[PDB]
Amino acid sequence: DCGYERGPDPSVSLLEASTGPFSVRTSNVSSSVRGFGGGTIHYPTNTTGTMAAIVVIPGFVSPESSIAWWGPKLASHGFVVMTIGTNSGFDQPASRASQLNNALDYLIEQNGSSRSPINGMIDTDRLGVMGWSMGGGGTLRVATEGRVSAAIPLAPWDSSSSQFRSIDTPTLIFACENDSTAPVRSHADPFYDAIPDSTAKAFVELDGGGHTCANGSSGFGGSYNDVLSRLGVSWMKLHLDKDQRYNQFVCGPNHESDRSISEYRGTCPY
Amino acid sequence: DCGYERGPDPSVSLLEASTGPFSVRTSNVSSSVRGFGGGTIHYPTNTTGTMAAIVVIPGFVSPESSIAWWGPKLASHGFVVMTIGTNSGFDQPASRASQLNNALDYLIEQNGSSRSPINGMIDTDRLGVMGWSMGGGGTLRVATEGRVSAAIPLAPWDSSSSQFRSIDTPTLIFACENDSTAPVRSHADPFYDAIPDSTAKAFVELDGGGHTCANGSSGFGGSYNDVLSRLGVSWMKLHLDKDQRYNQFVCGPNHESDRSISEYRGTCPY
Ligand SMILES: O=C(O)c1ccc(C(=O)NCCO)cc1
Numbered sequence: 001d002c003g004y005e006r007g008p009d010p011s012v013s014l015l016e017a018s019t020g021p022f023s024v025r026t027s028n029v030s031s032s033v034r035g036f037g038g039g040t041i042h043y044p045t046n047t048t049g050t051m052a053a054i055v056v057i058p059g060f061v062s063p064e065s066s067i068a069w070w071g072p073k074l075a076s077h078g079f080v081v082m083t084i085g086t087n088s089g090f091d092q093p094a095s096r097a098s099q100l101n102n103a104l105d106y107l108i109e110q111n112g113s114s115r116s117p118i119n120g121m122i123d124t125d126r127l128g129v130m131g132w133s134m135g136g137g138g139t140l141r142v143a144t145e146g147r148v149s150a151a152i153p154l155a156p157w158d159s160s161s162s163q164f165r166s167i168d169t170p171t172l173i174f175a176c177e178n179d180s181t182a183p184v185r186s187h188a189d190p191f192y193d194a195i196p197d198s199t200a201k202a203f204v205e206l207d208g209g210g211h212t213c214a215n216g217s218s219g220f221g222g223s224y225n226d227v228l229s230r231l232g233v234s235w236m237k238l239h240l241d242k243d244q245r246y247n248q249f250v251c252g253p254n255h256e257s258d259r260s261i262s263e264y265r266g267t268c269p270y
Numbered sequence: 271d272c273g274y275e276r277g278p279d280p281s282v283s284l285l286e287a288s289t290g291p292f293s294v295r296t297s298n299v300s301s302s303v304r305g306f307g308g309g310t311i312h313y314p315t316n317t318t319g320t321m322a323a324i325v326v327i328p329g330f331v332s333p334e335s336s337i338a339w340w341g342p343k344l345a346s347h348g349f350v351v352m353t354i355g356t357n358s359g360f361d362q363p364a365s366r367a368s369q370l371n372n373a374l375d376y377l378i379e380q381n382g383s384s385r386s387p388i389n390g391m392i393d394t395d396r397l398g399v400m401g402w403s404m405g406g407g408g409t410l411r412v413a414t415e416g417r418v419s420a421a422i423p424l425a426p427w428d429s430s431s432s433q434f435r436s437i438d439t440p441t442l443i444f445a446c447e448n449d450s451t452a453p454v455r456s457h458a459d460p461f462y463d464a465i466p467d468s469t470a471k472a473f474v475e476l477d478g479g480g481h482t483c484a485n486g487s488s489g490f491g492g493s494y495n496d497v498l499s500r501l502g503v504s505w506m507k508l509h510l511d512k513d514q515r516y517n518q519f520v521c522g523p524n525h526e527s528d529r530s531i532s533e534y535r536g537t538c539p540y
Contacts, residue, residue: 061330
């Protein structure tokens, strides 16, 4: 109804393809950028119209590289995706939340900058956040604030869960079953549980996943890319683009029948 | 020569055994302990004489459990080993160094405490430190100080390497080949390189190892336990006990011919 739909009527095959329908380019953000540690703006080059913006933030002492897989992946599906680094690897979730916000602000700024290749490409109303570990805690925190329209914490790490009762943002938590850094039992699980059941939410625990299981990979350890692409892209399509054509990949499937998904929870329908 | 030798003339089989020659017990250290986040004192129960004390410290936002494997492992070979937690998961290497020192101090204190099961069991002159990731940075930092007689950083993470030119302590760095949290190229390798070649040192990169590869494991992913036990126990025996019977396991073998060791460097002979 909102007219943000882009690209073909999707298919699992489209979602699990190495890249989405759009060619992607990258634009550097120096670490001199205010409010975060720089990053890479990934954007599609053969789309029309404006598109939602997504910031993907790493976890503790982790560089952008840790979550960079998500940039081209999501951008290829019709999003401006800035994978970023943090001011310090030591940044805690609250700081990462602030930097997520700063990075979102930055994409909004760059959307209006003649020097940016995404100038005029972003519907700045339509903002998604993603983040690994402490960055996933930051993501969940940003998901409480009412600006972003989708949040995908990746193996989130945070220090308390009750703050996330304020999440009305559609939040898909990728959990890593065997996460020993942000153990599901003390992080992804209570964070997910804290989110109101009225919130569009999903808990996708990746079978056998260690702490990096939801970061994607382009070389070794790519075994979760299908579910990450399928659910993550659809999540962002569904909630950032209001693209109901992607609903069926997040609400409908028996996710746990996926060999890569050890546990699924969600509040379907959305 | 120093008379600290304990246990039988070793063999690889002894070193790679599930446990060393000694039964171990554990004694709890509440997190209320001053100067670190509590821990577990592992000590052998059917030993005679005093033994060196080892503190094993975890990395960022990691609990003692992350490195706990080393407690029983080393204790069973004739050491008092306290696996500890940190005050905060957010503690940085310098703080972990201080907590390593506090934990060492604590073992020295407990050695003189009628309430400690290791009272009178510790030769407080003979101190080893081990630590994972930022705890390994802390370990390397403590290794600069002149009090400890052996240091085993496990996939160490730290923010600068030049400080480690001050390491005269026998330092065995376990590196994890595919570490993406403390990339060998920017952590274990320059930390090892910074140590003077006059220092007894070793760099043991575990083949295919992720960031936890040097932490040990009981069942799930235990594929490095042999090299960790063989080289780690021998390191501590050699340098804490001056037990030259263990020298041949650290100086002599073609370490890289071990299928678990992707790279070895060292300053043999010691
Ligand atoms: O043992 C460590 O020092 C250590 C453990 C976990 C992290 C981490 O959380 N990495 C993912 C991003 O948060 C960093 C360091």
